[PDB]
Design a protein around this ligand. Structure first.
Ligand code: NAG
Ligand code: NAG
Lengths: 433, 433
């Protein structure tokens, strides 16, 4: 559910301070620039099951750093991915069992904490058609509000023994040019080429190229960053800014409809579609233009308030599946929300007692009921949340992703211009009925 | 509630292995050796409120050692008592704010944990009349299954400016003799004298003596240990063994009825009273004869199992008010059980949703419903549990005390002889109606 408490919400045009009126109503602009999104080709949640159980003992924290993942996403230079949960668990156990082997009086002492750096969190299952070069080659990248640059996996292969599959070969483009870089970046390089997204042409687009078969290491064909221009882009016009500069009649906004079980998922450039949501679109101001990052005031699990006594922020990250909470909040969470047997028809009765999760931004309230944050895995119901600490800043980051948040809320990302700041819009998604 | 699952419980006489038949039914023996217990003169639970909040941050553990408290009870040689929660909290904050100032890759690191050693846990509010010496002087000690020796606070004072109060002066006894000790023990010494407990005379009883006004440091007039003979008694016949040797018709058992709001609380020597309990008395074998310590199999808070994957034991400790759990279990507990506003008549409606706490010993089940483990403090409902770690042994100890457990269950302590092992008996207390 989404609603504003207090005074009835008003159009954002009627605001006094555009930076302070959380929960105002967005002017809806219908757009015809639709980009269908499809399932990326495995939907296996055993990785998240193991991740939860590895937190049972209370001494394990997963973390990522701001900007250090592929394309400027959250990550580290480690080799750990979430797909590596059995290697990770084996190492955790080895490390723990080697340490247990190796007027008022209070006594300071040290406990062992095991940190698991994650390489990146890029694991959305929804990809869209991108056309690259001349004559055009089709790739299916993730469209990622949590990334800044464009990256494409190259799979060029001229030998006769190469498997016959759809490949992206930058040298088959008449218009591809390789750029000169003085940074030794599985290998990375930078080039430029022409792209087509939907009906929009985007020339002179700088992008990174990943070469080695290579999909043993990588789980996406590409990343189109929809973040902000800044140090993380390094003078290279990001894709969406480049689109806007070359297609001047497009309003600087894009929206996302995630409908996993209908095949109707969609990215919309330059506007929204009234058929994707119910009610109004409620606006949150972006506090730090880097990720799409919004100040978080409180967070409730039922009656229990778990946040926020310190500075907290929610990142809307379309390129990641799960929601996240920091390590202290997930202690409470995993005590309050249990995985259970669900079958598939017993599920509405099982979850009848689970608690509502309530995010509070000013007077704007976003609820996730249990059939909105629980997912099915074999015959087991599971909460679609990961424990992720973002230590980079003294503040605490929460992530809202595609499997839980966006499947239930229609989301609008509005770039701030000369007559508006950057904002995220949210509306109840169209009810599948 | 108390009940046995599986086969219907049978009298303990019908057992095969007397060490293995948990939940058998005790032969009831009525006894006339009743010792009324009264409220000790302040019933202030603000100390436990502060104790709970000092655990909020997850980095503070209270601990006691086996045998190191007064009379061989649980404690340490520190000066911290629970009455010192403001000194304790001030030190915790000072220590914390001085430290924040001063194929698979996992990363070991250290977190700070603050340990708070507690001097002792002797805080029951129920005391009984003991007569000491010739002509007899009245003291009101705690009768303490968690202690081993007899200790009495001496308050001798011959100066004219001494306050006129009931004092215990060992030198006013014609039969008191001071013993020779080679251990510098506020000061301690040992003597012997004659005691009377109820109708039973106990001559040649060795006991410790505490001298300094002295009740600024101590909160009890004395301790009569009802533990076991062993190293912690050091060749000095403990009180109850001495009673039995000199009064040979007394069966080696004693029982406790705790009725705080009726003035009907009672210790019963040599048997029980059928008017203090409903249903049958269910027997648990004592696994380690030192404290009255019983093996614990599982512990549930509602549907959630919090114990036991490692060796756990319950200590029945009549000299302490609150129940306890180790530090890891109270993390879960304080997330699942909250303090709240209660008034005094709103209480049955408030607690309607709280979870049942279930202790599991073999097939014997002991439940505490919320109106049995919650107590009132001002207009606030609070759980009568402390976090106590007993690090002395690799195993984990749980305490059951007087304010919660014994107020709701009638308890029988049965000394093991040539034709029985030591056992604790439990029955639902007589319903006040
Ligand atoms: C191509 O894009 C770059 C940004 O990386 C810009 O500075 C440059 O002027 C553009 N060149 C042309 C020919 O559009
Ligand atoms: C007094 O008690 C002690 C135990 O501390 C015992 O060894 C001794 O024999 C007793 N003496 C008499 C006279 O009863």
């Amino acid at each position: 559910r989404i609603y504003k408490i207090g005074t009835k919400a008003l159009p954002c045009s009627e605001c006094h301070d555009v930076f302070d009126c959380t929960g105002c109503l967005f002017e809806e602009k219908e757009s015809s620039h639709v980009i269908p999104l499809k399932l990326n080709k495995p939907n296996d949640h055993k990785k998240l099951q193991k991740h939860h159980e590895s937190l049972k003992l209370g001494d394990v924290k997963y973390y990522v750093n701001r900007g250090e993942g592929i394309s400027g996403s959250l990550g580290t230079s480690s080799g750990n991915t979430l797909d590596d949960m059995d290697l990770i668990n084996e190492e955790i156990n080895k490390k723990r069992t080697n340490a247990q082997l190796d007027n008022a009086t209070v006594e300071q002492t040290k406990e062992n904490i095991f940190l698991v750096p994650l390489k990146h969190l890029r694991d959305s299952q929804f990809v869209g058609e991108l056309l690259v070069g001349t004559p055009p080659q089709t790739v299916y990248p993730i469209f990622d509000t949590g990334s800044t640059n464009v990256w494409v996996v190259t799979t060029a292969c001229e030998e006769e023994s190469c498997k016959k599959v759809r490949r992206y070969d930058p040298n088959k483009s008449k218009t591809f040019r390789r750029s000169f870089i003085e940074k030794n970046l599985i290998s990375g390089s930078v080039g430029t080429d022409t792209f087509m997204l939907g009906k929009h042409l985007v020339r002179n687009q700088t992008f990174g190229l990943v070469e080695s078969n290579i999909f043993d290491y990588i789980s996406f064909e590409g990343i189109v960053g929809l973040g902000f221009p800044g140090m993380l882009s390094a003078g290279n016009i990001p894709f969406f800014d480049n689109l806007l500069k070359q297609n001047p009649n497009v309003d600087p906004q894009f929206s996302f409809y995630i409908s996993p079980y209908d095949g109707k998922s969609t990215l919309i450039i330059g506007g929204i579609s009234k058929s994707f949501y119910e009610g109004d679109i409620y606006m949150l101001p972006v506090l730090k233009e880097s990720y799409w990052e919004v100040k978080l005031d409180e967070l409730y699990i039922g009656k229990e308030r778990i946040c926020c006594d310190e500075e907290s922020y929610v990142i809307f990250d379309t390129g990641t599946s799960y929601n996240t909470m920091p390590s202290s909040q997930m202690k409470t969470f995993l005590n309050l929300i249990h995985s259970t047997a669900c079958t598939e028809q017993n599920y509405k009765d099982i979850l009848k007692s689970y608690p509502i999760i309530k995010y509070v931004f000013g007077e704007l309230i976003i609820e996730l009921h249990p059939e909105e944050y629980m997912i099915l895995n074999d015959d087991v119901c599971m909460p679609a949340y990961m424990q992720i600490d973002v230590p980079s800043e003294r503040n605490h980051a929460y992530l809202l992703g595609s499997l839980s948040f966006m499947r239930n809320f229609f989301t609008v990302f509005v770039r701030g211009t000369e007559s508006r700041p950057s904002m995220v819009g949210v509306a109840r998604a169209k009810s599948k009925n």
